[PDB]
Amino acid sequence: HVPPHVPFELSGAELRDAIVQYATNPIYHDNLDWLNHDNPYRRQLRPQVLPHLDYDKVPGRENILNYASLAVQRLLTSVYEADLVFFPKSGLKGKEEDFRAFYSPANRALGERIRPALERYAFGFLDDEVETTWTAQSLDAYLDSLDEQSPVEKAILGSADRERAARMWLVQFAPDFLSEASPMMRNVLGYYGPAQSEWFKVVIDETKHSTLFERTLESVGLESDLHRYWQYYLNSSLLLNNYFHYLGKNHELFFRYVGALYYTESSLVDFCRRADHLLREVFGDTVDTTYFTEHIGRMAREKIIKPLVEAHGDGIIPEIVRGIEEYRVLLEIGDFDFSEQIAWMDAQPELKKLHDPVFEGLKQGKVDAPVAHLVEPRGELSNTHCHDGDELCHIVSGTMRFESGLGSSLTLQAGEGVVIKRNRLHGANIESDECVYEIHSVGDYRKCL
């Protein structure tokens, strides 16, 4: 007789151990530099922190830019990308061991085992952000209803360094645009109706777009090897990219992808126009925007949505709508996260100065702040991360390079420091022989003023 089915279950300490097991593959160890040097097999997952996170407590939207969420997004990107083919720009010779470490039976199996729990952690909040009886007519009404300055335009054009802000923006798209259509290709494997051929026609349109975005990056002094700028990828940028791998890998979510595809096709011309205009205003004639201008909706409605609704019934419509609404939530989070990061980068001189009154407030006992006393040698590079409350970094002796973003750095000497804002991506390196410094966990730095 058939043995009983034990349901798949992985939680608590066993899940923590499984996540740590995946992430302690040596290719995921902290980088000694800020950049990956043409090695697409190395991704920084900061495995030393992973034993101390609670993967069972799924965060709501309000806590979705906390560190545990960033850590999970980084994990998921690596798990998903084991299905993608990468070779170094300079060729595979010399990088065979890393190649084999990333593409191994073990690395795939370890990542795939934790993937369900990681996806609940990453995407669970969307259950409460979105709510979806539908018919073809009411779907047509909802779609029709989907049709000024954008938050990204405002953040870049209003920046203290527009070129830096635009470069920080462009690198966010490196995983997506350089592997363009990869998540979409996941939906074209198999055997289904004429919708499969129509989905494949879209994939065919992409002279290859990846190569055009190489030129965009290179025209403003950025490189196009994955993932050079790993440590500068925002939480929300990974979240947006990972969403499409999530939909593409998990075919129970196929109809959500149908919806998201409609929305992306329907938004594509406006996005590309705005991107072209924004980049020209910032960089002038130096920037290559062919990638965006070459891309310049109804076809997805008629050729994909309609036949699927006819073949599979009205029951798929709430899934189609959910895909659109979930994606829109993620775009909002992206707008916020990116805007916050650019403001944080631009305000570094002021936040260096804010150290003094904040430090003085701690002395006067306005906040009772836990403090960590650290002593670190030269080249101890703390890979980028964030904290869930505000912190005060105070240098006692030596010299620290405090990294707040791409092209955004402060040198901090004895007696100096910086206010570190919650959820903002940052790291540090020690530039002197030894650096003695303090981290005060102030929660809200404004309470120290």
Place this chain on the structure above:
Amino acid sequence: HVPPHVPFELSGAELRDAIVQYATNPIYHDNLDWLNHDNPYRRQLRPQVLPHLDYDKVPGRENILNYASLAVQRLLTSVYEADLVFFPKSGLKGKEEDFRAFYSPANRALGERIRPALERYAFGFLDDEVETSGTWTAQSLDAYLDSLDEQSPVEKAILGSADRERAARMWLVQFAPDFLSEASPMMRNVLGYYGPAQSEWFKVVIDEYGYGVHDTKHSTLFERTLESVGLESDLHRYWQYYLNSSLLLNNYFHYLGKNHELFFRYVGALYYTESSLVDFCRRADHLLREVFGDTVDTTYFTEHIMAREKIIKPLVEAHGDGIIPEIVRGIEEYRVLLEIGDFDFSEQIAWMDAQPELKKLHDPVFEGLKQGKVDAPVAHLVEPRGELSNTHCHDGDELCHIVSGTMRFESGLGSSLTLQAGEGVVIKRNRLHGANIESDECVYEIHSVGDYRKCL
């Protein structure tokens, strides 16, 4: 600091339990019928047997058609196909629960966890079947590839059959998973970001996917081939009639496509398939016309009527001579699998055709057991109407003897015997077969004779 890395490890009883855990998803239970009825989420893995197999003892080529290998091939096909999109021909309505059972976080994770061990079981034998030289260069690769370019074993088996049309239909269904999802394993190698070779690989896939035109799409052409000889094109109607070796051949390309450390093996296999394609399609068209006449639609094959220069050469130049043994290994591994296919298929057709004679061979074999020529273990079975034993094989020969009632003994597609009281059949080792009980009750015996010829 970084905790120590515990290496991924799954073996022994823990591996057995993990395999059973995957395969006890209800969508993998025995079918009550011979055919799946337009439900692409149901695949018969015979989970009741899985606790009793030894997954740690990797078989060599000589034992690669044993039951444990068939069972593992069936598992792997299901694991790989969780990445492929299927909907029923008749639409999804009514099949939503099965859809969600196949495409679930749990079903994927359970299958992916056992996939490394399954792949060692399935493909480990190839380590001893292919040699790995350490002196490859571009010139010696060109010499080898040049040295690759009569009646085939498949042609002989079909044309020499007692029922040619039946043999050709059995042949055609072997390609259903491959041709109906055509280019799916190849698409796995086009995801990501690599050189100009990626675009060239994609240019091959575009031909196989009919440039996004459905009627011109190859899958649709093979639908017509199947339907023109009275077969259906819903996956996987004929699951129970898929040979071990046919699953092995299909799974090999999912193996190479999913595991990008094997990317250069796929480069090699792709070269071999492209260089053999015209000859295969000509022979297939000619063979099918000879068997079926004008009734058969062969457009799929005639439509199919450069990898060296556009894919192999740039990769060798970019990544160096170290990739060449992998390219060669892919070609040689694939050729070994084609040989196994030729053998397995030929053996199955001969087994199907010889059923009347094997029914008669029951008598002298049964008499030899009475005279004690072989000391054979025997299993006494009593089963009710409709107890359908899903297709499988055994590692030694068996004698099935019916004491009372009526059994439909299934040896292949369109190949059946009715066995009554006092009758029976010699069941040849490694040959795919099943049974159903056609009377209210059937009392029968299975004698494990090892080699039936020793009873004569």
